[PDB]
Amino acid sequence: SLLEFGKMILEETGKLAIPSYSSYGCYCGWGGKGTPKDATDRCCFVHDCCYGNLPDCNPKSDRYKYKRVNGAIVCEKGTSCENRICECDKAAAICFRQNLNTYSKKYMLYPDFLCKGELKC
């Protein structure tokens, strides 16, 4: 759920999930359209695609557990949905960490009309 995802983001990147990554670019937010703006936006597009493969799951409200094995995210055993939702999110947190260097404030609160083009999952 969003509670585990936002805490995963804060732990990995130092930034709070909201407003750093809930209004960034074309994909960090709610749905998405167009061509992702930068590496950080590409993490959100791949995240959106990961959730997109889990149609009878509910990634915003179904809670999972994860532990830190020295810094590494380890998803705990749960239902089959929770396991898969945890891997989508852990991949996004690591993607956000890997691209902290190119994170740009110019892309926070980015206008919709600028999200142009087509990209498939």
Side-chain angles (χ1 to χ4, degrees), residues 91-116:
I94 286 152
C95 193
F96 286 156
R97 173 62 176 93
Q98 189 157 224
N99 296 288
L100 262 187
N101 286 165
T102 56
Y103 178 102
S104 208
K105 293 165 172 200
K106 106 146 146 277
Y107 293 126
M108 270 170 74
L109 314 180
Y110 200 75
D112 181 280
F113 84 109
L114 293 169
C115 295
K116 294 171 190 196

